[PDB]
Design a protein around this ligand. Sequence first.
Ligand SMILES: [K+]
Ligand SMILES: [K+]
Ligand SMILES: [K+]
Ligand SMILES: [Mg+2]
Ligand SMILES: [Mg+2]
Ligand SMILES: [Mg+2]
Ligand SMILES: [Mg+2]
Ligand SMILES: [Mg+2]
Ligand SMILES: [Mg+2]
Ligand SMILES: [Mg+2]
Lengths: 121, 306, 173, 94, 170
Amino acid sequence: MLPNYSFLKVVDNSGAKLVKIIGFYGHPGKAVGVGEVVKVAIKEAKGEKVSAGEMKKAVIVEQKFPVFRPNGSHFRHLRNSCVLLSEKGQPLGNKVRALLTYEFIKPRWSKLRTITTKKLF
Amino acid sequence: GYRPAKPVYPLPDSIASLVEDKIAELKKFGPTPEPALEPLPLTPDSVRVGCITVKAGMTHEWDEHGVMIPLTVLWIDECQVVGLKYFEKNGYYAVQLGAGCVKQHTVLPQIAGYYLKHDLPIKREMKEYQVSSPEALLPVGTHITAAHFVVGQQVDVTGYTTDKGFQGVMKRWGFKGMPASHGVSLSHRKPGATGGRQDPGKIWKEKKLPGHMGDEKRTQLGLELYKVDPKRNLLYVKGAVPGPRGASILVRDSNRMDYEERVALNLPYPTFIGSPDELPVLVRKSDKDPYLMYKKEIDYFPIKWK
Amino acid sequence: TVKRFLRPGGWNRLNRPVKERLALIKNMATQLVEKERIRTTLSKAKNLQRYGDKLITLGKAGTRESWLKANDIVRTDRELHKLFTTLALRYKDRQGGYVRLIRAGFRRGDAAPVAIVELVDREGELRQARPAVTPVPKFSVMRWVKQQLDPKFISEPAPLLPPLVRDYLKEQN
Amino acid sequence: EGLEHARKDAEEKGLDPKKLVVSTVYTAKGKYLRGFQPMGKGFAGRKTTRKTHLRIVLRENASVLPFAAQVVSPSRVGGASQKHLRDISVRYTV
Amino acid sequence: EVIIPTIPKYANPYKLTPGVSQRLRTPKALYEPWCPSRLLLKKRNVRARMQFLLDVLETEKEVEFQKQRNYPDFKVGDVLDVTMVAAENERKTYVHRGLCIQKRDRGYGSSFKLYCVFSDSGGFIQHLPLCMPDILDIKIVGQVDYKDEEDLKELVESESRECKFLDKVL
RNA sequence: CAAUAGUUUAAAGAGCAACGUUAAUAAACCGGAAAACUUUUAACUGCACUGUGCAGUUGCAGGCAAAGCAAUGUUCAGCUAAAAAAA
Ligand SMILES: [K+]
Ligand SMILES: [K+]
Ligand SMILES: [K+]
Ligand SMILES: [Mg+2]
Ligand SMILES: [Mg+2]
Ligand SMILES: [Mg+2]
Ligand SMILES: [Mg+2]
Ligand SMILES: [Mg+2]
Ligand SMILES: [Mg+2]
Ligand SMILES: [Mg+2]
């Protein structure tokens, strides 16, 4: 449950460190969570691939708000993080230091499921 | 209330006898019909009777797929046919059902008189259900039990909601209010404007204002019947039911279901004939996969790549 | 019966803050033990009846832990000594209901309701209370029912020292 | 007090107290004590204590209303109360 | 010309307790909460009887569950190994190791919280119903000392010395 | 309001709440008057009652117990005490 204009930490190796949400896509409501794609602005980057002041797409991977499952259980993280994506829908890096959850078992996240180190499933 | 009574006058002697003869002729009725309890075919336009139940509370269970299901428990103490209506006397056909039990010295003589006259217990609540044909009438005294319903169907529930007292616009109608700071003065939770100026010059009817909230009749449609316990007269329904514990709830076959669905269920008609004691506890089976979205793309995704 | 509210414990607010509320009820409870009959307003009487019953329960306990709790409630040493010695023996067999409340109309000035709170077994009692242990007829359905449900039903008052304690003392001496 | 005083007056005149009916009652203005009370910003108000006269007339066999009140006994306290003699063994039977 | 009504019979001759499902140390009840009001020796409120009806149903489900599973009596501060099935991943079995930080004893609605820390991703918390069928086994493997709730909360916020197993097994 | 999150120390498996759960895309749903019909010796306070009484005398959210604590058990408190003998 992240409202618009929230700050996120980048967990890929593309070079970006800090981003801010500036928009949503479709009709998600007043807040977004894990598995949704948003529009972000880069605030702090140290690299050649990306620079501060650019606008990119990203996917939410971790959040501190409870994530509910059909069986009645839920889990929480201790940080909010995202992964930058290209216009074709592929990550801008090749190594993700994050814990992948059940949301990414879906077919559309095959690339993320390959470059991630630790997986909960 | 009622309007003041209208004046009455004696009839002239040349007309009084004629009026009385005609009024008596219209008020003369034939013998009461005697319904017979027998299975009947179900037709495209044929409504069944409902039942009167008591709300017990909420619980939860896990289904065959391991999913948590919230449930509301309804208890049917004793529901019986306590009267009939027919065209000759009332102009339409209906069945009257009563439920509950009260002591004789706690009700008015008018209420107790009807039940004593037919050798029936004094019942706390009474409600009417309209039928389509005279053959749909049930004999007086027939019991309506939990076996009246088929597990897995959809039902409608009606009742009175929980009383909340005198409440403001923010809680009663969800008004936004006014800012907590920036110079606001004693108007944080007030409704604000209620009209304009000289035109139109008045406040419209049903304008939303503070008042009492919480004791009103509400209906929920399309709830699922999860489990049935004919022996103990229990119904387990998924979802929320209006009213607090002990509220009186009316249960009916949902109008959202089509004729084909009713035929497939093979609902009892006019009602279940037999002894419900020797019946097992049944749970509905759902031929659906709640985890299909993890194998196939069926979910909502607004972005088109490339 | 005494109404139950939504605050912690379900007690009355007595139109006072919690700190002043506790100071008042402790003082009145001390006076009830000393005099055994008090006339006051209905709200203070209802709260005192329920609070008074729980203070007698501590006295019946006769333990070090119970005395510590009671020592923070009673205001006078003489009243605390009476509670553990005299009232403890008086209500050995009575299971609850050690205090009664009877309404007595309205006052003169502010027309407030009033009532009388009293102990239920003593000389000077307003009425005669039922025996602490109810006698059971020898040929009644009640006697058979109690045997089937509670074989340890008590039908007559028990002595201060039960036979097991008496037998031990006799064997020792 | 007025009702009792009037009945005593009726008996002296030779009327039956068991047939008396309240036939007329009304009030009358007395002499008032005037006063003043200060208000804010130098304004002033009135502070008056009022007084009234009361008149009651009782007559025999006058038109009367049919209202009647039910009467019950008060709480029984003392040796006249015998609730402690109740036998509770009957309620265990069928 | 006289029709005699039918008198119902007694289910358990000369037994004063119907034998409803209740916990071992609870005094036995004398009536069935689902019995019609007309056939009761005592006419108790419907509202109060409905509360008792739910308690009986809860205990019936708890008895069935205990026959199917047998878990240890763990406490807060113990390290646990929990075997679970992931319905999302084609019902595959995994084993999780973590610390128990919260335990609620509320009958059929009991639950607990499991905490673990990873090498780089940080802390991770799960809330698990105790009677959920997805859980297959629970075992106690160790204990972590703490002084009070404040100390335990500080430990959770500052991830350290909670990396029992870096990843999930199976 | 079963579960999940927040909130009260004369505390809690309380109550109220949404950030939580269920339902709707309709001749469906809701409100007041009233024909007709039925019943009656034509009916008419009250449980501390400024939450609810779907509780009126083996009635009860008081007290008391080894008890899940507005539930189960119960001999006490208050409102409202009962019976021909014998065959
Ligand atoms: K209007
Ligand atoms: K509900
Ligand atoms: K106590
Ligand atoms: Mg606001
Ligand atoms: Mg100003
Ligand atoms: Mg202000
Ligand atoms: Mg204006
Ligand atoms: Mg001045
Ligand atoms: Mg509630
Ligand atoms: Mg209590």
